[PDB]
Amino acid sequence: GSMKLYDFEVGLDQPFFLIAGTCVVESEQMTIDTAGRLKEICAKLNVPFIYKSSYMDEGLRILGEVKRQLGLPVLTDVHSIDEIEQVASVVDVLQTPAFLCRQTDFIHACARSGKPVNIKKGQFLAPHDMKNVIDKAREAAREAGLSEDRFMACERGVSFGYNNLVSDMRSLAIMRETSAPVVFDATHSVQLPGGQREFVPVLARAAVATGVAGLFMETHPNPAEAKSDGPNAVPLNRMGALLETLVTLDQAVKRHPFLEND
Amino acid sequence: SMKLYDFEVGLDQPFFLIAGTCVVESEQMTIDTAGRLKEICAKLNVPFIYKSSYDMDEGLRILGEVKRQLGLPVLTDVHSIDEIEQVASVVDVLQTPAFLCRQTDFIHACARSGKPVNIKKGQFLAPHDMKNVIDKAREAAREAGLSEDRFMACERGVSFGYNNLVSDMRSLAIMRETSAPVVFDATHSVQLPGQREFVPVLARAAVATGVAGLFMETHPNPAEAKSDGPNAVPLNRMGALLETLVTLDQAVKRHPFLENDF
Amino acid sequence: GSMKLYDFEVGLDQPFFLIAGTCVVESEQMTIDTAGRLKEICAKLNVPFIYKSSYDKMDEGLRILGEVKRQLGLPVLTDVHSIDEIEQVASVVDVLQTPAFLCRQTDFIHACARSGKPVNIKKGQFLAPHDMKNVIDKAREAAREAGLSEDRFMACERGVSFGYNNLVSDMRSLAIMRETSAPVVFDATHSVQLPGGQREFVPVLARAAVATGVAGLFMETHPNPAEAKSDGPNAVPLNRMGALLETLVTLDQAVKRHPFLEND
Amino acid sequence: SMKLYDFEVGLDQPFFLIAGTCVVESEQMTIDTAGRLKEICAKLNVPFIYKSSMDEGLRILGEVKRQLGLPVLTDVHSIDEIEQVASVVDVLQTPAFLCRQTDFIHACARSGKPVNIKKGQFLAPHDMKNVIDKAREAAREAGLSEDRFMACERGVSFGYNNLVSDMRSLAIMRETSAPVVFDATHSVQLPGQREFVPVLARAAVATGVAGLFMETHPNPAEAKSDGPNAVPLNRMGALLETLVTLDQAVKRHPFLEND
């Protein structure tokens, strides 16, 4: 399942794309500044790039400005059914909170919004459960007269005892049965339910070698203020270096079929 | 940056492979399969340690023939203090069952054996718990007049509910604090306390995370290697898998790991 | 921690109350019969009883619940799944109950909190026990903001994720959630769930939970035990409810006769 | 069901208590504390096995056994200790991590003494049947009776640095046809939790078990909430009175789950 997203193609058989945004809220002008830096970093490496909003009316307006000034596709989380219409009018991709993955009214209202949807897998789900979630979203899309190839399955961690998430790299393989692009959320997969930014690169490298369609990471736009006890965000001035590694990994594992298929 | 016979191993070296079979074969076939593995690894310049399929006196004789005929370093599991002399008198590297990782009498008998030891992390340990295991093992070696840089720390999964292990890639980075080479066991990490499909998945993830070494079992009879069989890569696919893994390992070791700078 | 719940008071210092409903939908007439049978089973043992709707997984379901109330006088609880359902179920039901996975969906929980009805708030299987305090405190602020009293919430244990497709019931949670200052309810039916087939553990966990010390207990019952197999819903056969409840009464009395030692 | 020292133990019997101290005492105060536990348990008719808090430890355990006429239990840690330990004690106990180390479990099996086999924190409850079935094969091949083993729940790993007590395990392990023992002190321990010992004890006894292990703190003056996972000695009577009431309640009639 390799689908169209904005003006590029995404999927397990395509070069990985990045979703990134900031771990702090900036002024309008600085939000554009940071988005522009990310655009340039990704452009030089040829990594397809979707900008994610740092946060409602005002947040959406600024996202609209990012889209218009920088020609970027943008993505935001939607939190309730009542928000969908307003958000989907502005953004190119909706993203659902993990804990709502089985709130069928909500997921289906997103599915019929007219925009593609990055569906986060609840931390209480087994990887096989995503197939049901995607199948029912597709049925909602069909019934609204919309194409079915408009969903991604997003791994964000599974509950591991109390106050911890583990990233089971097996999930990234299993969710290929959804026939939907698999997206790895590196920032939320390290979060204790900040202080874990050291594991963002670790998990990103592991996930990209596992084989995914896309990756989400938050970035810290003020490396001067970016500390190990802060958000689980990669400093902006190190993003280039990490992406170069991830491109090499992505190319390596997609040069030939994954053995586990073969 | 540990010396291990003919080569050096470590996070700062190319990864080494420990591999042996998921089935016991006749003596002649055992030598045959060890030979094939030696050549596969030779063509790719992957340092190779052979693991015994017998882990009794008969199995040690056959392992003796493997070493004499092929010159391979040999690794074996040992299960009790008595097996150490019986074995450490024939093999080059000892390996300890994960469930015995805090059985200090046994781990310290291995530490004083005169052979290097790959010490498996218990499925009930947290990654930070390995430092104390290695530190006490090094103490034992020192008290016996042996050098301290003779231990590896081996990740083999952590318990995840009932009848399931999960491979937390964070552990591979955390155990770097042991100043011991970290080894990833891909075959036992997938096991349900029928999962061969996850062996290449976890090997790629672990190699991209950054390890000193990797353990995988191989199936020597690919005509009879099935999905519901052992958690083993068919011998005829090992070369292709190792080529992927070499590419990933070289890629992540080209520069310092980003997480070091956090 | 005590709380008025219509005709009775509930709390760690009161006799436990039961929430029970069927695990299958029955005809209108068997629905009424079954509700009367449960009423009687509980009446004979003096177990305060709240009837749970079988129709909550519409207007018909609500009509029938209306007949249950009008005919039998039972207080009625229902799961609600969206903000819209709150107003829809208002004329019939007495107690709202929230899906576990919505425990942090603030718009939804605060709508429940403002409904005018008390609410049994299920703890998500992704939460740790200490997390429930903030959930309850948020619900109370919403209640306050709407001119409603704050002593109208209960905290319901329904298990926590344990690897894949498995829930474990950490009895420590039932003690820890006392810090919410709200009655703690144990859901013995969804706590055995394998995210049916686990009905053998419903009495096990109900006994354990009541001996741990709770305000309330939710169990489903099966009205047609002869159809009720080991592979079916996680429900106590209706003809065994009396015997189980007599055991649970005895446990509840034993553990509340004196202070809980963990409080010393 | 089976005979243990002087008495019958099992799901169809009044629960027995295994208890020992959370701190090593002097010989005389070890004796006094075992004495006080003995009296507490006798007043309530609770069958009581004392667990030791190597030569010297076994010497003192032998004095407890003899002077107070108590059965005694201790952990064995290697095959090499078995013969020395079994000549002194009435019940062997195996560390949970060793539950699959079959040469070691089977040596305990042939020892001639009964064995309380701890379920490792890495095992699923169904896994104990194979462990116990093999122990029994080892007993039989040695000419000993097969009804000399107990399955002991001590927690299962729950993420990192935490154990959870799945009360389902206590019912599932009934399939072993061996008495199930609940370890309330080790089931709370983080791989400062004494407040959960009474919680888990009440829960396990209501679930239905043959036996219960708890540590007690013999110096309640020094016994703190940040201290061991141990019930102060002066509160054991009150706790045991509650537990007996629960044990009688759930054993009065068959367990509903037995359908």
How many other CB atoms are there within 10 angstroms of residue A7's CB atom? Answer: 8
* Total number of domains constituting chain D: 1
Exposed e or buried b for every residue in C225-244, given b needs 16+ CB within 10 A?
A: eeebeeeebbbbbbbbbbeb
B45: left (phi over 0), alpha (psi -120 to 50) or beta: left
Report the residue from C162, C175, C251 with minimal CB separation from D206.
C251
- Chains in contact with C, where contact means 3 or more Cβ–Cβ distances below 8 Å, are A, B, D
Report the residue from C212, C236, C251 with minimal CB separation from D249.
C251
Q: Quick check: C136 and C179 in contact, CB under 8 A?
A: no
* CA A105 – CA C105 distance, rounded (Å): 14
Alpha-carbon distance values, D223 to A196, B63, C176, D17, D227 (Å): 37, 57, 21, 21, 6
In chain B, residues with a C-beta closer than 8 Å to the C-beta of A199 are 170, 173, 259
In chain D, residues with a C-beta closer than 8 Å to the C-beta of B99 are 97-98, 100-101, 120, 122
Q: For residue D118, what are the β-bridge partners?
A: D152
Query: What is the Cα C114 distance to its own chain's centre?
Result: 20
In chain A, residues with a C-beta closer than 8 Å to the C-beta of B240 are 256, 259
- Residue D245 corresponds to which tokens in the numbers above? 């009431």
* Residue C72 burial (10 A CB sphere; 0-12, 13-18, 19+): middle
Instruction: Please answer yes or no on whether C203 and D257 come within 8 Å at the CB atom.
Output: yes
Phi and psi dihedrals of C85, rounded to 5? -65, -25
Report the residue from C169, C204, C247 with minimal CB separation from D171.
C204
Report the residue from C82, C104, C126 with minimal CB separation from A124.
C126
Which ranges of C89-131 does DSSP label H, i.e. alpha helix? 106-114
Residue with tokens 């290097």: B116
What is the residue type of D24?
Answer: V
CA distance D154 to chain B (A): 13
* CA D128 – CA A154 distance, rounded (Å): 38
Instruction: Please answer yes or no on whether A170 and B241 come within 8 Å at the CB atom.
Output: no
Report the residue from D78, D124, D157 with minimal CB separation from B124.
D157
What is the residue type of A123?
Answer: Q
Angle between the B104-111 and B130-143 helix axes, to the nearest 10 degrees?
50
Instruction: Please answer yes or no on whether C162 and B164 come within 8 Å at the CB atom.
Output: no
* CA A107 – CA A133 distance, rounded (Å): 8
* CA A156 – CA B36 distance, rounded (Å): 41
Instruction: Please answer yes or no on whether B99 and D103 come within 8 Å at the CB atom.
Output: no
CATH code of the domain in which B94 resides: 3.20.20.70
SS (H, E, C) D177-193: CCCEEEECCCCCCCCCC
Whether D166 and chain C come into contact, CB under 8 Å, resolves to yes
Q: Quick check: A59 and A91 in contact, CB under 8 A?
A: no
CA distance B2 to chain C (A): 37
Whether A145 and chain D come into contact, CB under 8 Å, resolves to no
* CA A214 – CA A175 distance, rounded (Å): 13
In chain C, residues with a C-beta closer than 8 Å to the C-beta of B160 are 163-164
Report the residue from A166, A205, A210 with minimal CB separation from B166.
A166
Whether D10 and chain B come into contact, CB under 8 Å, resolves to no
CB pairs under 8 A between C and D: 105
- Residue C64 corresponds to which tokens in the numbers above? 């029938």
* CA C217 – CA C206 distance, rounded (Å): 7
* CA C72 – CA C248 distance, rounded (Å): 24
* CA A94 – CA A151 distance, rounded (Å): 10
Instruction: Please answer yes or no on whether C170 and D170 come within 8 Å at the CB atom.
Output: no
* CA B248 – CA A84 distance, rounded (Å): 41
Whether D124 and chain B come into contact, CB under 8 Å, resolves to yes
DSSP for residue C123: P
Report the residue from C104, C164, C195 with minimal CB separation from A99.
C104
- Chains in contact with A, where contact means 3 or more Cβ–Cβ distances below 8 Å, are B, C, D
Radius of gyration (Cα) for chain B, nearest Å? 17
Instruction: Please answer yes or no on whether A126 and C101 come within 8 Å at the CB atom.
Output: no
Q: List all residues of chain A from 207 to 246 with a beta carbon under 8 Å from chain D.
A: none
A164 → chain D, closest CA residue: D159
Report the residue from D101, D103, D121 with minimal CB separation from B124.
D121
- Residue A218 corresponds to which tokens in the numbers above? 């938050």
Whether B174 and chain D come into contact, CB under 8 Å, resolves to no
CA distance B123 to chain D (A): 7
* Residue D72 burial (10 A CB sphere; 0-12, 13-18, 19+): buried
Whether C102 and chain A come into contact, CB under 8 Å, resolves to yes
Residue with tokens 């409904």: C115
Resolution to one decimal, Å: 2.0
- Residue A216 corresponds to which tokens in the numbers above? 């989400």
* CA C233 – CA C188 distance, rounded (Å): 12
Optimal mutation site among C125, C161, C162, C164, interface B, most CBs of chain B within 10 A: C164
CA distance A135 to chain D (A): 31
Name residues whose C-beta falls within 8 Å of residue B235's C-beta, 6 or more positions apart in sequence. Answer: B33, B36, B37, B218, B219, B220, B222
Domain extent, residue A205, equals: 1-262
Give the technique used to solve this structure: X-ray
* 3-state SS assignment for residue C97: strand
Report the residue from A99, A100, A129 with minimal CB separation from C126.
A99
CA distance A156 to chain B (A): 14
Q: Quick check: B101 and B122 in contact, CB under 8 A?
A: yes
- Residue C238 corresponds to which tokens in the numbers above? 């209706």
In chain D, residues with a C-beta closer than 8 Å to the C-beta of C211 are 202-203, 205-206, 246
For C11-75, where are the E strands, in sequence order? Answer: 17-22, 49-52
Pairing of strands A8-10, A3-5: antiparallel
Instruction: Please answer yes or no on whether A162 and D159 come within 8 Å at the CB atom.
Output: yes
